[PDB]
């Protein structure tokens, strides 16, 4: 099996804007998670060819990773902060769907998700 193409990160047909919530998601939320000890399995799409996981994209039909989210923020792909929060939540849910309790990658996801939730509790005010 091939890997699927990664998620779209730029779309010329979508309107663009900057907002303080989007700035905060990139320059505070994403940045904090990106540097975390446990972030590396989440920094790029799962390469199921290289890792020989041919069932990964038979189970996970909405793949997402922080590399894609970073590119989406940097390309102004999101209009609403909740779109970006939704992608982080998809990334974590995909981990819990594919993996078992007790697995290392689940412990890693749980720690990142805890930190993610703490950081988005401090999202600044909407315009
Ligand atoms: C091939 C890339 N590598 C060499 C260039 S690698 O980045 O060094 C590397 C090396 C060993 C690895 O197990 C990984 N695993 C992951 O990334 C990863 N992420 C997630 C969210 C998952 C997995 C795999 C476990 C099960 C599925 C899952 O939920 C990555």
Residues 87 and 9: beta-carbon distance below 8 Å:
no
| Total domain count, the chain | 1
Q: How far is the CA of 46 from the centre of ligand 1 (A)?
A: 6
Asked whether residue 1 is assigned to any structural domain, the reply reads no
Best residue among 41, 63, 64, 106 to mutate for probing ligand 1's pocket (most ligand atoms within 8 Å of CB) is 41
Which residue's alpha carbon is at the smallest distance from atom 26 of ligand 1?
Answer: 99
Percent helix / strand / coil, the chain, rounded to 5: 50, 0, 50
Resolution in A: 1.5
Distance between CA 81 and CA 101 in Å, rounded?
A: 30
Name the structure determination technique.
Answer: X-ray
Pocket flag, ligand 1, residue 97 (CB < 6 Å): no
Closest listed residue to residue 64, CA positions, set 100, 50, 121, 78: 78
Asked whether residue 10 is assigned to any structural domain, the reply reads no
Asked whether residue 97 is assigned to any structural domain, the reply reads yes
């Amino acid at each position: 099996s091939m890997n699927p193409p990664p998620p779209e990160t730029s779309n010329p047909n979508k309107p663009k804007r900057q907002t303080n919530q989007l700035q905060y998601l990139l320059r505070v939320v994403l940045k904090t998670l990106w540097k975390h000890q446990f972030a590396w399995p989440f920094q790029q799409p799962v390469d199921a060819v290289k890792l020989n996981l041919p069932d990964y994209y038979k189970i996970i039909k909405t793949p997402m990773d922080m590399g894609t989210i970073k590119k989406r923020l940097e390309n102004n792909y999101y209009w609403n902060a909740q779109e970006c929060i939704q992608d982080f939540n998809t990334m974590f849910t995909n981990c819990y769907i594919y993996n078992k309790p007790g697995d290392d990658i689940v412990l890693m996801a749980e720690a990142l998700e805890k930190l993610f939730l703490q950081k988005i509790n401090e999202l600044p005010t909407e315009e």
